[PDB]
Amino acid sequence: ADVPAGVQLADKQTLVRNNGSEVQSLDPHKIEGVPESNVSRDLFEGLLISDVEGHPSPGVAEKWENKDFKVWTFHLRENAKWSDGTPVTAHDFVYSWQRLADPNTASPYASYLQYGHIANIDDIIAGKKPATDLGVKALDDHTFEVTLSEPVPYFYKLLVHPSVSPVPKSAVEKFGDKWTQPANIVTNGAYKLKNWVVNERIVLERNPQYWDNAKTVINQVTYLPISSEVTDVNRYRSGEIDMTYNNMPIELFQKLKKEIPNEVRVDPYLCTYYYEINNQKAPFNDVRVRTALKLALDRDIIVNKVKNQGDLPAYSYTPPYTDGAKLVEPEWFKWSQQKRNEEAKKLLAEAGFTADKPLTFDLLYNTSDLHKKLAIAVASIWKKNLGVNVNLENQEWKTFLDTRHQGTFDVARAGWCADYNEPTSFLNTMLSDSSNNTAHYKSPAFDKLIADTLKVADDTQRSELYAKAEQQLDKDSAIVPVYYYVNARLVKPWVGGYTGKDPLDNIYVKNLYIIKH
Numbered sequence: 358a359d360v361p362a363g364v365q366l367a368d369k370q371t372l373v374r375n376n377g378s379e380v381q382s383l384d385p386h387k388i389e390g391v392p393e394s395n396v397s398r399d400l401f402e403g404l405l406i407s408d409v410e411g412h413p414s415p416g417v418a419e420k421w422e423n424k425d426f427k428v429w430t431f432h433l434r435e436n437a438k439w440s441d442g443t444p445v446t447a448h449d450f451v452y453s454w455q456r457l458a459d460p461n462t463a464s465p466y467a468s469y470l471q472y473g474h475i476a477n478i479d480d481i482i483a484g485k486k487p488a489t490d491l492g493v494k495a496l497d498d499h500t501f502e503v504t505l506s507e508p509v510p511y512f513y514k515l516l517v518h519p520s521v522s523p524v525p526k527s528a529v530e531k532f533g534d535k536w537t538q539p540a541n542i543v544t545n546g547a548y549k550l551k552n553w554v555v556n557e558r559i560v561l562e563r564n565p566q567y568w569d570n571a572k573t574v575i576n577q578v579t580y581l582p583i584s585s586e587v588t589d590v591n592r593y594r595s596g597e598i599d600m601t602y603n604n605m606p607i608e609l610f611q612k613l614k615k616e617i618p619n620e621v622r623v624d625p626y627l628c629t630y631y632y633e634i635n636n637q638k639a640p641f642n643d644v645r646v647r648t649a650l651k652l653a654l655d656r657d658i659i660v661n662k663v664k665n666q667g668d669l670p671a672y673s674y675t676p677p678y679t680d681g682a683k684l685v686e687p688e689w690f691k692w693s694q695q696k697r698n699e700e701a702k703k704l705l706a707e708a709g710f711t712a713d714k715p716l717t718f719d720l721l722y723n724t725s726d727l728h729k730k731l732a733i734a735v736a737s738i739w740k741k742n743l744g745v746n747v748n749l750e751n752q753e754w755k756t757f758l759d760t761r762h763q764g765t766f767d768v769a770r771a772g773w774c775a776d777y778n779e780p781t782s783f784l785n786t787m788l789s790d791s792s793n794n795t796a797h798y799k800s801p802a803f804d805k806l807i808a809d810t811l812k813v814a815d816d817t818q819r820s821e822l823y824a825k826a827e828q829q830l831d832k833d834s835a836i837v838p839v840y841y842y843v844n845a846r847l848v849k850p851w852v853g854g855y856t857g858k859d860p861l862d863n864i865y866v867k868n869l870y871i872i873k874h
């Protein structure tokens with residue numbers, strides 16, 4: 358943390374953050390969500406990290422160079438250490454990225470190494486070459502060298518993500534699945550795990566071996582797993598929570614902006630809220646059904662009337678303000694809602710649905726007051742605009758993500774937040790073989806458009822290709838875009854260091870500080 362001259366620090370430097378739900382895991386290779394990544398940034402540090410404004414900056418790597426955007430060499434700081442005092446080396450990264458690539462690990466982020474195009478990843482994922490063939494090597498204890506199969510100019514931007522953080526081989530090997538328990542875990546970020554009580558709290562304590570420990574200010578941070586946004590706000594306003602999670606309650610938000618304006622932080626965020634359609638399951642493998650659902654949803658009602666928190670109606674998967682995004686708005690988005698509804702009803706009548714044999718299916722969402730309120734509105738809108746019946750179903754976060762990976766679903770509430778600010782952080786997730794492809798969407802045409810983006814060495818051609826990839830997605834109605842998020846949360850006046858300037862919201866508690874109050 359960089360505490361401003363003249364600010365007074367509180368005697369006690371402790372922080373309580375709500376984190377939305379119980380994490381899937383603390384293992385960097387078994388996670389894919391925001392709540393998971395919130396805790397991972399405090400415990401595990403990769404080659405680069407985001408600075409307080411979100412720019413990719415030195416992490417374990419203090420400096421790096423690239424040869425033709427294909428061979429990247431990272432010079433690791435001599436004093437990077439794990440929490441047991443042993444050195445963080447380039448061999449740690451070698452073992453780590455191989456473990457990420459290995460199909461036996463089953464990471465939901467195995468494909469992150471495809472997105473960066475590390476050499477031999479496709480074969481490794483396919484079981485054809487062992488994970489040891491991956492294009493990574495330690496040229497020495499403090500030098501990590503990555504070889505890609507094509508030039509990727511934005512490659513380093515990917516490296517702040519938890520899936521490319523190191524994991525400690527000895528704890529992993531020795532304790533297997535229990536390596537992340539507090540008595541076993543070893544970490545290299547600014548914090549260490551102190552306590553982990555499932556469905557109660559996660560408590561982290563400063564890691565004194567962290568290389569930048571002298572600038573760390575908060576000695577302890579607790580992450581809570583509260584999925585009720587109302588409860589989160591209540592415990593924030595009672596004094597227990599210093600920073601809510603960034604899901605705000607429909608019940609209280611308008612009142613909060615009028616009551617504690619200075620505390621309600623609202624900033625740009627690179628995430629899209631949509632309904633994920635299970636593209637491989639009838640009748641959702643029919644484009645007319647997906648197009649109907651997409652068109653009959655009234656974004657104006659949902660965004661402006663039912664939510665009303667500053668979100669923007671969405672017509673694409675990649676947020677239009679992502680760096681490099683130059684998207685074309687489909688004509689349906691400028692049509693009337695009435696005109697959307699007729700087209701929709703027309704398509705469903707064409708797909709064979711009547712009044713007598715209507716379309717009925719499940720709407721799966723992760724336990725939350727906000728998602729429940731939004732699914733109820735969407736269910737009534739779909740019912741009135743299109744005659745479809747939906748059965749709402751909630752599942753705890755971890756179970757919800759697993760259900761979507763398994764494909765044991767019809768439609769699900771969904772939200773993707775960028776991992777790096779470039780259109781492929783979204784688009785690569787709809788690739789046929791992506792491990793992040795929970796829409797279970799498979800389009801040869803869509804895959805070819807994205808593969809083409811690294812064949813050209815031009816950014817204009819590249820943006821035009823991302824634009825057409827978004828048009829292929831929309832044409833197929835792979836999803837139902839609903840709105841582009843804003844990052845809205847409550848933060849106490851004594852919490853310093855949070856700018857709200859990072860559109861990825863990659864917060865590190867090592868950057869925060871408690872002002873005396």
Ligand SMILES: [U]
Pocket residue numbers: 368
């Ligand atoms: U004190």
Ligand SMILES: [U]
Pocket residue numbers: 510
């Ligand atoms: U650049």
Ligand SMILES: [U]
Pocket residue numbers: 680
């Ligand atoms: U940029």
Ligand SMILES: [U]
Pocket residue numbers: 718719767
């Ligand atoms: U269903």
Ligand SMILES: [U]
Pocket residue numbers: 587608726
């Ligand atoms: U509620």
Ligand SMILES: [U]
Pocket residue numbers: 510816
């Ligand atoms: U470039």
Ligand SMILES: [U]
Pocket residue numbers: 874
């Ligand atoms: U106080």
Ligand SMILES: [U]
Pocket residue numbers: none
């Ligand atoms: U106090």
